[PDB]
Protein backbone atom coordinates (compact mmCIF):
# COMPACT_ATOMS: atom_id res chain seq x y z
CA UNK A 1 0.00 0.00 0.00
CA UNK A 2 0.95 3.64 -0.09
CA UNK A 3 0.54 5.86 3.08
CA UNK A 4 -1.61 8.76 3.25
CA UNK A 5 -0.55 12.27 4.48
CA UNK A 6 2.45 11.91 6.74
CA UNK A 7 1.51 8.24 7.15
CA UNK A 8 0.26 8.20 10.96
CA UNK A 9 -2.43 6.22 10.22
CA UNK A 10 -0.81 3.50 8.17
CA UNK A 11 -0.98 0.11 9.44
CA UNK A 12 0.24 -2.25 6.67
CA UNK A 13 2.67 -4.63 7.11
CA UNK A 14 5.73 -3.87 5.58
CA UNK A 15 9.02 -3.81 7.27
CA UNK A 16 11.92 -2.52 4.87
CA UNK A 17 13.68 0.70 5.00
CA UNK A 18 14.80 3.25 1.99
CA UNK A 19 18.30 1.36 2.45
CA UNK A 20 17.09 -1.76 2.06
CA UNK A 21 17.90 -2.29 5.84
CA UNK A 22 15.27 -4.63 8.03
CA UNK A 23 12.65 -2.68 10.80
CA UNK A 24 13.54 -4.20 14.30
CA UNK A 25 10.38 -4.85 16.27
CA UNK A 26 8.84 -2.17 18.49
CA UNK A 27 8.88 -4.59 21.27
CA UNK A 28 12.50 -5.38 20.95
CA UNK A 29 15.48 -3.98 23.18
CA UNK A 30 18.13 -5.11 20.43
CA UNK A 31 20.18 -4.23 18.42
CA UNK A 32 18.81 -0.61 19.39
CA UNK A 33 17.27 0.66 23.34
CA UNK A 34 14.73 2.69 23.11
CA UNK A 35 11.40 3.80 24.49
CA UNK A 36 8.55 3.27 21.34
CA UNK A 37 7.00 0.89 22.25
CA UNK A 38 3.72 -1.00 22.05
CA UNK A 39 3.69 -0.88 25.94
CA UNK A 40 4.20 2.82 26.00
CA UNK A 41 2.74 3.68 23.28
CA UNK A 42 -1.11 1.30 23.07
CA UNK A 43 -2.89 2.87 20.04
CA UNK A 44 -0.02 3.52 17.61
CA UNK A 45 -0.37 0.47 16.06
CA UNK A 46 3.30 -0.42 16.80
CA UNK A 47 2.72 -4.36 15.99
CA UNK A 48 5.68 -6.88 15.08
CA UNK A 49 8.44 -4.89 13.16
CA UNK A 50 5.84 -2.77 10.79
CA UNK A 51 6.46 0.63 9.48
CA UNK A 52 5.08 3.00 11.31
CA UNK A 53 4.80 6.67 12.60
CA UNK A 54 4.06 7.35 16.01
CA UNK A 55 5.29 10.63 16.48
CA UNK A 56 4.19 12.88 13.55
CA UNK A 57 7.19 12.37 11.34
CA UNK A 58 6.68 13.00 7.76
CA UNK A 59 6.46 9.02 6.68
CA UNK A 60 6.38 5.60 8.40
CA UNK A 61 9.55 4.75 9.83
CA UNK A 62 11.40 2.21 11.89
CA UNK A 63 14.26 1.16 14.12
CA UNK A 64 16.70 -0.91 12.10
CA UNK A 65 18.30 -4.27 12.64
CA UNK A 66 21.45 -2.68 11.45
CA UNK A 67 23.56 -1.46 14.87
CA UNK A 68 24.89 1.41 13.26
CA UNK A 69 21.50 2.73 12.15
CA UNK A 70 19.08 3.76 14.95
CA UNK A 71 16.11 4.41 12.33
CA UNK A 72 15.14 5.12 8.96
CA UNK A 73 12.14 5.92 7.03
CA UNK A 74 10.55 3.00 5.29
CA UNK A 75 10.36 2.51 1.17
CA UNK A 76 6.84 3.47 0.92
CA UNK A 77 5.30 6.16 -1.09
CA UNK A 78 2.78 8.73 -0.37
CA UNK A 79 -0.65 7.67 -1.50
O1 LIG B 1 15.19 7.26 19.57
C1 LIG B 1 14.04 7.35 19.18
C2 LIG B 1 13.68 7.63 17.75
C3 LIG B 1 13.55 9.13 17.58
C4 LIG B 1 13.33 9.55 16.13
C5 LIG B 1 12.34 8.64 15.40
C6 LIG B 1 11.89 9.24 14.08
N1 LIG B 1 11.27 10.55 14.31
C7 LIG B 1 12.32 11.43 14.81
C8 LIG B 1 12.80 10.97 16.17
N2 LIG B 1 12.92 7.19 20.02
S1 LIG B 1 13.08 6.70 21.65
O2 LIG B 1 14.32 5.97 21.86
O3 LIG B 1 11.83 6.11 22.10
C9 LIG B 1 13.24 8.26 22.44
C10 LIG B 1 14.47 8.65 22.93
C11 LIG B 1 14.57 9.88 23.56
C12 LIG B 1 13.45 10.68 23.68
C13 LIG B 1 12.22 10.28 23.19
C14 LIG B 1 12.12 9.05 22.57
O4 LIG B 1 10.93 8.57 22.03
C15 LIG B 1 9.85 8.48 22.97
F1 LIG B 1 9.23 9.70 23.05
F2 LIG B 1 8.96 7.56 22.48
F3 LIG B 1 10.23 8.09 24.22
CL1 LIG C 1 -2.20 5.53 5.72
Given at each position: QCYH????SYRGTFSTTVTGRTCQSW????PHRHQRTPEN?????????YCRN????TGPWCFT?????RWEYCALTRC
Amino acid sequence: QCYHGNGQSYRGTFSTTVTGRTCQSWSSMTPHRHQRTPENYPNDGLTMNYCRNPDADTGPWCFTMDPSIRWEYCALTRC
